[PDB]
Paper text:
The transcription regulator teicoplanin-associated locus regulator ([name]) is a member of the multiple antibiotic resistance regulator ([name]) family involved in teicoplanin and methicillin resistance in staphylococci. [name] regulates icaADBC, spa, sasF (the first reported regulator for cell wall-anchored proteins) and sarS transcription. However, we showed that [name] interacted strongly and cooperatively with single-stranded DNA ([name]), which suggests a novel [name] function in regulating DNA replication and in resisting [name] phage invasion.
To understand how the [name]–[name] interaction regulates multiple [name] functions, we report the crystal structure for [name] in the [name]-bound form at a 3.6-Å resolution. P3221 [name] crystals were grown with a 17-mer GC-rich [name]. Each asymmetric unit contained seven [name] and two [name] molecules with two [name] dimers that interacted with one [name] chain, one apo [name] dimer and one apo [name] monomer, respectively. In the [name]–[name] complex, we observed that the dimers A/B and C/D (colored in green/cyan and magenta/yellow) interacted with 11-mer and 10-mer [name] oligomers, respectively. The [name] complex structure reveals the full protein shape, including the β-wing region, which suggests that [name] stabilizes this motif. To bind the [name] oligomers, the DNA-binding wHTH motif of one apo [name] dimer subunit rotates by ∼20°, and the wing tips translocate ∼21.4 Å (measured from the Asn 89 Cα, where prime indicates residues from the second subunit). Thus, the [name]-bound [name] recognition helices move closer together, and the intersubunit tip-to-tip distances decrease from 61.5 Å to 49.1 Å (measured from the Asn 89 Cα). The wHTH motifs twist in relation to each other to produce a sheared orientation, wherein an interaction with the target DNA is highly unlikely. Among the interacting residues, Arg 70, Lys 74 and Arg 93 are strongly conserved in [name] family proteins. Interestingly, Glu 138, Asp 141, Tyr 142 and Arg 143 are unique to [name] and not conserved among the other [name] proteins, which might explain why only [name] has been reported to bind to [name].
Author numbering:
A (entry chain B), B (entry chain A): 1 to 151
Write the structure that this text describes.
Amino acid sequence: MVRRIEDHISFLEKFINDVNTLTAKLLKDLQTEYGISAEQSHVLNMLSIEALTVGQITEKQGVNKAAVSRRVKKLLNAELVKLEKPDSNTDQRLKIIKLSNKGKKYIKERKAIMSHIASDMTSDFDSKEIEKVRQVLEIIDYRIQSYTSKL
Amino acid sequence: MVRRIEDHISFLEKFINDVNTLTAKLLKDLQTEYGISAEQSHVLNMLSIEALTVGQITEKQGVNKAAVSRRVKKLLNAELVKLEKPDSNTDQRLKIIKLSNKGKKYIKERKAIMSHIASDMTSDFDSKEIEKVRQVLEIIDYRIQSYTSKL
DNA sequence: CGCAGCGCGCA
């Protein structure tokens, strides 16, 4: 079973980006309606989970110092993302940012489009068998977290 | 039951990002040891599944037609990744970008890497309770591959 | 403190 998991990891690595490629194509309309960019829906999304700093966002994907700040430099500018303390400076390491009601009603319009196409894709399933999936994926998740802590 | 389906996608959303971050904060190993920008790494993941062209490579994301072109040439004018016809001006239609020896030699390294971790991570499971999960997963992925046809 | 607004059809 040493060649087995290399597959289950290869599949996920497949099923994963087939969820990625989809999202983007399936969403492009509301990213031209809201005028952003993929590499921004993926940035918005992360705070649609809960508030983050710019220093907190960088570690997650690419360790781009401020090449990712030119990507939040637009985000705020388009009203979407809003600030920490309306007190004025030129400080960027201080502030923490969250989504404004505009980057929030984007999200309502986002998790409505997927909370359609997937509600379909799965409308025929056993729940006492889709939980038995959720669960297993909760663990491998949890684990993945109590390891996204350590080394 | 009309909503329960919701948390699942967000969860599945969440879940990748985690998986997405672990691979990154974990492959930042061989990434620099091959002198490659992180997201480039991503580009290679598909080319690993089959033969492919720049147009195709942009299909799994957004309008990065001359935006993911640097990305590929940064894997051409920089190591790994072959080209199709060792000489080509700029016409990317006669260009069919494949993989060089190390094009696997990297995927071959990275894979067994992100694997021992997934070998560890899951090891108290009877192959049976993972398998099930793999199936419902294989399905939801099929349904995606198809519904990724019309547009 | 490494780039952004462009190859919608081209035999």
